[PDB]
Amino acid sequence: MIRTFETHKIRKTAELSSALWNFHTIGTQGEEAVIQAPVPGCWENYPDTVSYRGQASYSREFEAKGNIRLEFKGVSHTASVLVDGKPVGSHYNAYTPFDVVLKDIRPGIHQLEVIADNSFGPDSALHVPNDYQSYGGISRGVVLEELGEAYLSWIHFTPFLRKDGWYGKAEICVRNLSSGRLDGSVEVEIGKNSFAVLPIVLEGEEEKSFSTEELPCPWAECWSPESPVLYLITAVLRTAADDIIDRVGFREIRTEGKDILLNGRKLRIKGFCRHEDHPQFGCALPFSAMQHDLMLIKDLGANSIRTVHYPNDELFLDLCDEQGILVWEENHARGLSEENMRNPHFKQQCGDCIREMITAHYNHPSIYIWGILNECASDTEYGRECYSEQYELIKSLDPYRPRSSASCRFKTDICLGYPEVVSYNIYPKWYHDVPVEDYLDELYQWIQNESEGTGKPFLITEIGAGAIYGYRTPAHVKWSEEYQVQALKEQLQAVFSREGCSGVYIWQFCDVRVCDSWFGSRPRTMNNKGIVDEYRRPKLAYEVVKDSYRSLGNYFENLYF
Amino acid sequence: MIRTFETHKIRKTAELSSALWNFHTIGTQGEEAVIQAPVPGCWENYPDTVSYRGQASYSREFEAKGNIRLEFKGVSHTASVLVDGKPVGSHYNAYTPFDVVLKDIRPGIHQLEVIADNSFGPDSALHVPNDYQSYGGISRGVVLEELGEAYLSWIHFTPFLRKDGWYGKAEICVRNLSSGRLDGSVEVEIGKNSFAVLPIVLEGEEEKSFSTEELPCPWAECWSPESPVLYLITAVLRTADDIIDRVGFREIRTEGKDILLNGRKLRIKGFCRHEDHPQFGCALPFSAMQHDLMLIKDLGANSIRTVHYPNDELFLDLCDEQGILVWEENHARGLSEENMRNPHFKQQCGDCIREMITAHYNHPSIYIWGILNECASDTEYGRECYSEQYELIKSLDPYRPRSSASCRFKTDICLGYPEVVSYNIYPKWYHDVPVEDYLDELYQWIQNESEGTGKPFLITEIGAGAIYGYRTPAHVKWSEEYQVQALKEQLQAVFSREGCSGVYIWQFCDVRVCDSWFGSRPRTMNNKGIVDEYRRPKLAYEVVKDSYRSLGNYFENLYF
Amino acid sequence: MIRTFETHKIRKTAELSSALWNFHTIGTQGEEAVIQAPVPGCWENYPDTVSYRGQASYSREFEAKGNIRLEFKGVSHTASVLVDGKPVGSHYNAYTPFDVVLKDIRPGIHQLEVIADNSFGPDSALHVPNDYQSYGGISRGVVLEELGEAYLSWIHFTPFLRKDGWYGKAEICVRNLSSGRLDGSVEVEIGKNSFAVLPIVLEGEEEKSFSTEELPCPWAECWSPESPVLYLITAVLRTADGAADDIIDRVGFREIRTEGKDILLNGRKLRIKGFCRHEDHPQFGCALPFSAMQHDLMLIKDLGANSIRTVHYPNDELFLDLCDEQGILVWEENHARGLSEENMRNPHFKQQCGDCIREMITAHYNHPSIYIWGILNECASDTEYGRECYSEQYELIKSLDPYRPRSSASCRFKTDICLGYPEVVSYNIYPKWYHDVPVEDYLDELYQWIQNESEGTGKPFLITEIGAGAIYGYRTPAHVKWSEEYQVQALKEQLQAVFSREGCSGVYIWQFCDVRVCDSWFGSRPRTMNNKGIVDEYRRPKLAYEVVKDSYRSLGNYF
Ligand SMILES: [Cl-]
Ligand SMILES: [Cl-]
Ligand SMILES: [Cl-]
């Protein structure tokens, strides 16, 4: 399983994942055991490599002829792809998809080998020792596609809410693998309604996109948390032959003043930060584990998830689309110092992550905002140059969705003029003993009186508290579940009564494994601020969050007129 | 119960602790509940004050006439004593004893009240937010004595090992409560052997001490871990009063790189142990003390280090009787140069040292006095403080060796002063370096670059954290498996380190700490116990036992 | 420490416990090395004997001359006492005190040895494989007394509430150790008020009891939970030598009486808000120190309870002292739990029950906290032979204590044939734990059967056990049994029902804390523990702690 729907009926495709591949670590003189390992999977979950950091090899065979495309949905975190022993592709970043395209291969059985590497060091500017784990392995699916002379690389659909109803625009990218000029058309349907036919002309080996005009969609129903209506959009390429199928929802997301507006209504965010992490599956969570998390998150009363701190599996985003859950998705970065951001690969790897993330995820109605550079050095001049570059990269790829960044630069951020939404991570009553209301008011007033973020929508993108599941004390000391109950009660009461604040993401949904270097401040070498523990067992604070989130709706309905 | 033996047969004494007193917190405008609270006890263990920091009041009644003495073995941490509503004494520091002497009180029933305070702030230089808890309450016992017009305030006995066997010297301090001059004698016996009779002459209101000569003790058998023979020493004043203590005939001295007990080269197999228990705070009863001791003995240890303050004399009694060697230190842990410059610091350290050595002089188990654990021994002001306190110790007990647990890795400027050089190190917990390499780099520097060169060397702390119950195949830090492998490596290194006399593992059990340390202390506990706070053995318990049981108390096979 | 007050000022005494003694196992094919062990203590808490069942030796020395008494407050569970290598006494039952009296011993150093045995088998009819542990060792204190030619063996004080105020009677037992006749008097004062003088004539080697009349005590204030006023009662034996001996105890002026369906305390209708509590602790076995006792009591008071039931044996006098001073009502029972009809015809059963009852009431008579005597918890009250035993033992209690009410915690649901005998009818029930039946229905069906079809009709009625299991830390959204959430639900329904039941004087929750049990019970006892505590064995509150506290604190001590 790769998506919750079929993305191709014409193109010949087959999943190479959901299978056992041959696996062995590399980097030694001797023999290494070859074991049969699951793909998707993380090798930190296999008994003999629970602690392995380094390179390892995954291999299997496949059968194919002609022009082929191998799509990799995620390899943690550095990949080299070899087909029949020849290097044919490479990739950095565990959390965004990539592909290898091979022209006119011999028919028959081929050998596929992926070298996966989770090492830290100078080549890796995003994956570093950090407050979450960098796993190793083929952590998301793998797809073999047999192509013809040309194929549909992607389709991006954009809804528009006009005075008279829903309009839409489609943009399609076609890649010609033939050395000669190519002619044809692309026919586009949305939910079996006719939409457009685009004439295509490609010069030899050209990749180019073609846009339709803004067309009416009088048949379209809204996507919203209360009614998550989705449509399949289909593009069929005809030459002298190929398709792509995606899913869309008709919703508008814009900011106006201090309001985040969804389909014209003032949104209240009731959210969770959620890592892709699980004690048995690493970051390779199967469908069943995803939906289990989503059902707990819905039980808690939440309407939104924030993908700390990297792009998520499209299968998870699909499930948010289908259930009306709003998504903040951000590029892969957490807590990087100014010196970290001057790594010579940092800008290229951020740009690559952003490009791949938005190109792949453009169509997900659940995604209402793009985030960047969580807790990076937004208080420095060199930091500001990076924030500016990446914010403008986002706008060039998606001019419509709002943008933001979760800041921890308390009253020293110099980048708040750039985003549409100002967002702050704060931990009063955990890392600072100050009443939450006072801390939040001091920060909010500074933003409005002293920063270029004034008058914009404002989110608390992290608030919460640690608790080791099972540690309970009449003294309610920090790390006890009782103390976490008290902290979350006070924290949520303050954020939801802060005028000008659109809502909150609790840090965080579940406890998460972190890097060994963080052990000193991370009991059990875990981040323990989950409202459920790593085994999804509800801590005492679970009932406090549920009471709070279930007492509030998705929209501000009773604001002053 | 105050001691494991009776310290008085002539003097009239009654224990006022081991009882319920009336208790309420103070500092409010309204009514506070009066509850019946145990003494000894810490109010952090009573349900309604588990989080209380501040002042509280303890009171009961007692019957007495004439001259009386009220001895407090411990009040956590600042005390004010009132009798019939009049202030009559005060005290700072939870861990040392003190007394209140009142002259010629009317007969009948009297009101005793103790105001205990565990507050932090500028008045308190030793009790600070720290990596252990500052409890509140009457945490050790309370004794009422009815006195005549003079009494024995203490007796100190010193054994000497000479060419021809054991000698002894005794010093007794007598205090006169009458305005008139006082003449008498003091008869001293050890184990019902005649020892000396000292003539006494005291001016009015004078406290003065008198010493016997060095006298042979050919009947004396030695005290040692293998054979902890003890004798009762009794001093009887005649003008009428007595004092009884216990002594052991053992010699402790350093010679080169050796710590010598009765001429034999000692190997320390130790545990750091706080006075901490989840039910009893720092007010552990006899049964809880002996339970710890039986675990420590089962582990193969021969020694305990009183981190980071003097211990209950009842615990030291149990160590004397069981042959356990004790490192006892004054109350201080981790104080910066700025903390040490607190206007009260020098006074409070001096008072702690005086009360500690005066009260504990006779315990044969105590083989070394420590000071100023992890204080600022790398600074000049620190050195001034270490110097003063080391010399104070020598003036009070010129015979035991002195030391200090340092963490000033290659920067300590105070290693010229003590008889033993001692270091706290945490390789494979706080620093990922092979233990053998870290210890070698430190040991070489001491020998080649410091005035600690050529003296005996102890590791006074080494260990690793483990949250009891957290286990994982990945052996991450805080898992019990990781603590197993850390301790195995650490112990292997210290016992193979030539020049090192042994080790105190940090630590025996998990210990509650202050809320300000939560960030680096899971569960607001120090989790480096080999047993958890409920005394349940962690996985590493078997690794320590395997190490300690495979080694004796002495270096028997050194090069000749 | 043996008691919270001094029981002697004239008699010369010295505690031999609160000390290390020499300890080694005996009778094994292993090494029997000697270690230094605490007394009081249980050897299951010493690392090398954590699993040891059998015999072991405790020894120390003492110095004494002439007539001596050695008092043993508790040896678990079978003792042989030797002095200077010669056997001088023996005892069965872990939980009652006993003494050894020795005439005219040589002066100087003596060797004391105690062989303690916790084995199960045919000689032991009370200590059996059971739902609680039979520890081994000297588990309570030991006292050496140097006596003269006679001594005060006990003093029993009984208050009476009359129309014109408090009255009192005192009975003293004096034991002459001389072969010659003894003339003297016993002078008794209560709180420094003069009470009585009893003239004494004792033949050679006689032990005899002497009573006063019922005398007025106009100065006396009463004992109650709200005001637990206590007085020290002092008896001094005066002979030709002067004040030759004494005995000091403590009393409280309170009346306990049943009248109809009411348990009356100083006239008021009592409500029991109680806990069953074993003497069990994971570090201390059954040898809990003063600090551990008071920690338990402070938790029990925090929970809103006013009463404790000593499941299932007599308790340390130190604990009962602490209940006296804090106004906690005590149900105390003899040592027996769940013994079948066949278990009860063990040839030693009646002797051992009788010995336990005699020692319990003779030693504990004066405690004002004790308001009721229980016997034979969950024994074979539905059989004819069981009835015979109940009748014997109830009659034995009345001959030792004709004033306190009596009872027995029954589980013979609608089949008990012994409810005519006691003053209070008591039942253990576990609806919503062992039977899935709504608590109110089950309790109604039982209570109507008692009023309509048994000779228990019209008497006061208690639920002496109700509760549910929970393994601390096991929590699940499914609220399965053994989860802490399920225990919350069960206790809420359970306490609502009992306090709603017309004719019920109250309840003892089973139980205060989780308790170690015998290995043979493991099949139904997770962790080889009884897990029905409201705190766990380490005294950590389970979720149901808050449910109990809300229930108990919403009700007063009286109807
Ligand atoms: Cl954390
Ligand atoms: Cl720790
Ligand atoms: Cl159970």
Using a CB-CB cut-off of 8 Å, the residues of chain C touching A538 are 477
Q: Let me know: does A372 contact A405? Beta carbons within 8 Å.
A: yes
Q: Let me know: does A53 contact A116? Beta carbons within 8 Å.
A: no
Nearest beta carbon to residue A523 from set B51, B473, B478: B478
Using a CB-CB cut-off of 8 Å, the residues of chain B touching C294 are 20, 38, 41
Instruction: Report which residue type is found at C500.
Output: S
Classify the C-alpha dihedral A99-A102-A107-A113 as positive or negative.
negative
Distances from the Cα of C399 to the Cαs of A84, A244, C97, C253, C322, in angstroms?
101, 98, 20, 22, 27
Q: How far apart are CA A499 and CA A91, in angstroms?
A: 45
Residue C539 to residue B38, Cβ atoms within 8 A: no
Q: Let me know: does C315 contact C279? Beta carbons within 8 Å.
A: yes
> What's C513's DSSP letter?
B
Count Cβ–Cβ pairs < 8 Å, chain A vs chain B.
54
CA of A207 to the centre of ligand 3 (A): 72
- Nearest-neighbour CA in chain A from B466: distance (Å): 8
Q: Does the annotation place A555 within a ligand binding site? A: no
Nearest beta carbon to residue B36 from set C36, C302, C326: C326
Strand partners, C531: none
Q: Let me know: does C186 contact C152? Beta carbons within 8 Å.
A: yes
- Nearest-neighbour CA in chain C from A332: distance (Å): 35
Strand partners, B75: none
Nearest beta carbon to residue B291 from set C283, C299, C538: C283
How buried is residue A37: exposed, middle or buried, by Cβ count under 10 Å (0-12/13-18/19+)?
buried
Q: Let me know: does B131 contact B426? Beta carbons within 8 Å.
A: no
Residue A538 to residue C473, Cβ atoms within 8 A: no
Q: How far apart are CA B234 and CA B224, in angstroms?
A: 22
A458 contacts: CB under 8 Å, gap ≥ 6: A258, A421, A422, A423, A424, A444, A447, A500, A501, A502
Q: How far apart are CA A308 and CA A318, in angstroms?
A: 17
Q: Let me know: does B201 contact B183? Beta carbons within 8 Å.
A: yes
How buried is residue A495: exposed, middle or buried, by Cβ count under 10 Å (0-12/13-18/19+)?
buried
- Ion ligand 2 residues within 5 Å by Cβ: B 465, 526-527
Q: Let me know: does B420 contact B259? Beta carbons within 8 Å.
A: yes
Q: How far apart are CA A261 and CA A267, in angstroms?
A: 6
Q: How far apart are CA B136 and CA B120, in angstroms?
A: 11
Give the full edge-to-edge strand order of the sheet including B142-147.
B12-15, B142-147, B66-72, B98-105
Q: How far apart are CA B46 and CA B58, in angstroms?
A: 13
Instruction: Report which residue type is found at C300.
Output: I
Q: How far apart are CA C174 and CA C165, in angstroms?
A: 30
Classify the C-alpha dihedral B466-B472-B476-B482 as positive or negative.
positive
C386 contacts: CB under 8 Å, gap ≥ 6: C341, C344, C379, C380, C418
CA of A308 to the centre of ligand 2 (A): 28
Cα angle vertex A40, ends A39, A44, to 5°? 95
Q: How far apart are CA C97 and CA C69, in angstroms?
A: 13
Q: Let me know: does A203 contact A150? Beta carbons within 8 Å.
A: no
Tell which of A472, A473, A536 to mutate to test the C interface (max C CBs under 10 Å).
Answer: A472
Distances from the Cα of B68 to the Cαs of B65, B88, B96, B149, in angstroms?
7, 12, 20, 10
First to last CA, chain C: 38
Touching chains, A (3+ CB pairs < 8 A) = B, C
Instruction: Report which residue type is found at A23.
Output: F
Residue A44 to residue B474, Cβ atoms within 8 A: yes
- Nearest-neighbour CA in chain A from C480: distance (Å): 14
Burial per residue of C199-238, b for 16 or more beta-carbon CB atoms within 10 angstroms, e otherwise: ebebeeeeeeebebeeeebeebebbbbeebebbebbbbbe
CA of B272 to the centre of ligand 2 (A): 14
Closest CA to A522 of A531, A530, A513: A513
Characterize the bridge pairing of strands A227-228 and A231-238: unpaired
Q: Please provide residue C218's backbone torsions phi and psi, each rounded to the nearest 5 degrees.
A: -70, -25
Distances from the Cα of A378 to the Cαs of A307, A406, B103, in angstroms?
20, 10, 72
Residue C289 to residue B288, Cβ atoms within 8 A: yes
Run of H or E residues at A483: helix A481-497
Q: Does the annotation place A332 within a ligand binding site? A: no
Using a CB-CB cut-off of 8 Å, the residues of chain C touching B45 are 295, 298
Number of other residues whose CB lies within 10 A of the CB of residue C195: 20
In terms of phi and psi (left: phi > 0; alpha: psi -120 to 50; beta: otherwise), the region of C373 is: beta
- Of all residues in chain A, the one with the smallest CA distance to B468 is A524
Distances from the Cα of B114 to the Cαs of B61, B87, B106, B438, C494, in angstroms?
12, 10, 20, 49, 44
Q: Let me know: does B374 contact B382? Beta carbons within 8 Å.
A: no
Nearest beta carbon to residue B280 from set C37, C291, C299: C291
Q: Does the annotation place A522 within a ligand binding site? A: yes
Q: How far apart are CA A15 and CA A145, in angstroms?
A: 9
Q: Let me know: does B22 contact B138? Beta carbons within 8 Å.
A: no
> What's C424's DSSP letter?
S
Q: How far apart are CA B189 and CA B235, in angstroms?
A: 7
Residue A537 to residue C475, Cβ atoms within 8 A: yes
Task: Tell me which method was used to determine the 3D structure.
Answer: X-ray
Q: How far apart are CA A335 and CA C12, in angstroms?
A: 75
CA of A487 to the centre of ligand 1 (A): 14
- Nearest-neighbour CA in chain C from B427: distance (Å): 31
Helix%, strand%, coil% for chain C, nearest 5: 20, 35, 40
Using a CB-CB cut-off of 8 Å, the residues of chain A touching C540 are 472
Q: Please provide residue C353's backbone torsions phi and psi, each rounded to the nearest 5 degrees.
A: -65, -45
Measured CB to CB, residues of chain C less than 8 Å from chain A are 473, 475-477, 540-541
Closest CA to A45 of B477, B472, B470: B472
Closest CA to B354 of B172, B213, B161, B154: B154
Nearest beta carbon to residue C295 from set B20, B279, B295: B279
Q: How far apart are CA A309 and CA A345, in angstroms?
A: 19
CA of B465 to the centre of ligand 2 (A): 5
Q: Let me know: does A116 contact A179? Beta carbons within 8 Å.
A: no
DSSP one-letter string for B434-461: -HHHHHHHHHHHHHHHSTTTTS-EEEEE
In terms of phi and psi (left: phi > 0; alpha: psi -120 to 50; beta: otherwise), the region of A190 is: beta
Q: Let me know: does B210 contact B172? Beta carbons within 8 Å.
A: yes
CA of B75 to the centre of ligand 2 (A): 27
CA of C526 to the centre of ligand 3 (A): 6
Residue A520 to residue B467, Cβ atoms within 8 A: no
Touching chains, B (3+ CB pairs < 8 A) = A, C
CA of C380 to the centre of ligand 3 (A): 22
Q: How far apart are CA B117 and CA B137, in angstroms?
A: 8
Nearest beta carbon to residue C539 from set B20, B279, B284: B279
Closest CA to C89 of C76, C74, C70, C73: C70
Distances from the Cα of A70 to the Cαs of A112, A145, A362, in angstroms?
10, 6, 21
Residue C540 to residue A472, Cβ atoms within 8 A: yes
- Nearest-neighbour CA in chain A from C541: distance (Å): 8
Q: How far is CA B375 from the centre of its chain?
A: 18
C184: tokens are 């003297």
Domain spans of chain A? Answer: 1-148, 149-252, 253-561
Distances from the Cα of A292 to the Cαs of A289, A381, A535, B41, B331, in angstroms?
5, 43, 11, 49, 53
Burial per residue of C142-165, b for 16 or more beta-carbon CB atoms within 10 angstroms, e otherwise: bbbbbbbbbbbbbbbbbbebeeee
Using a CB-CB cut-off of 8 Å, the residues of chain C touching B294 are 37, 45-47
Q: How far apart are CA B425 and CA B418, in angstroms?
A: 19
Half-sphere exposure of C122 (CA within 13 A, CB side): 1
Closest CA to A136 of A75, A93, A90: A75
Q: Please provide residue B218's backbone torsions phi and psi, each rounded to the nearest 5 degrees.
A: -70, -20
Nearest beta carbon to residue B288 from set C36, C283, C326: C283
Would you mind telling me the total number of residues written for chain B in this entry?
Answer: 560
Touching chains, C (3+ CB pairs < 8 A) = A, B
DSSP one-letter string for B486-520: HHHHHHHHHHT-TTEEEEEES-SB-EE--GGGGGG
Q: How far apart are CA B255 and CA B454, in angstroms?
A: 9
Q: Which residues of C carry a binding-site annotation for alpha-D-galacturonate? A: 131, 312, 337, 377, 434, 465, 525, 530, 532
Characterize the bridge pairing of strands A326-330 and A304-306: parallel
Half-sphere exposure of C73 (CA within 13 A, CB side): 24
Q: Computed over its alpha carbons, how large is the radius of gyration of chain A?
A: 24
Q: Please provide residue A404's backbone torsions phi and psi, each rounded to the nearest 5 degrees.
A: -165, 180
Closest CA to B269 of B527, B34, B546: B546
Distances from the Cα of C303 to the Cαs of A131, B363, C274, C462, C534, in angstroms?
42, 44, 10, 19, 10
Q: How far apart are CA B274 and CA B252, in angstroms?
A: 24
Closest CA to A245 of A233, A229, A253, A254: A233
Half-sphere exposure of B199 (CA within 13 A, CB side): 2
Instruction: Report which residue type is found at B55.
Output: Q
C32: tokens are 């029997």
Q: Let me know: does C20 contact C159? Beta carbons within 8 Å.
A: no
How buried is residue A301: exposed, middle or buried, by Cβ count under 10 Å (0-12/13-18/19+)?
middle
Instruction: Tell me if residue C81 falls in helix, strand or coil.
Output: strand
Q: How far apart are CA A492 and CA A507, in angstroms?
A: 12
Q: Does the annotation place A181 within a ligand binding site? A: no
Strand partners, B322: none
CA of B429 to the centre of ligand 2 (A): 10
Closest CA to A465 of A445, A499, A491, A439: A491
C535: tokens are 């705190």
Q: Let me know: does A354 contact A93? Beta carbons within 8 Å.
A: no
CA of A468 to the centre of ligand 1 (A): 8
CA of B513 to the centre of ligand 2 (A): 10
Q: Let me know: does B152 contact B355? Beta carbons within 8 Å.
A: no
Instruction: Tell me if residue A287 falls in helix, strand or coil.
Output: helix
Q: Let me know: does A182 contact A201? Beta carbons within 8 Å.
A: yes
Residue A51 to residue B475, Cβ atoms within 8 A: yes
Characterize the bridge pairing of strands C109-117 and B165-176: unpaired
Instruction: Tell me if residue B290 falls in helix, strand or coil.
Output: helix
- Nearest-neighbour CA in chain A from B482: distance (Å): 11
Nearest beta carbon to residue A474 from set C476, C477, C541: C541
Residue carrying the six token digits 């506070």: B32
Using a CB-CB cut-off of 8 Å, the residues of chain B touching A51 are 474-475
Q: How far apart are CA A362 and CA A365, in angstroms?
A: 8
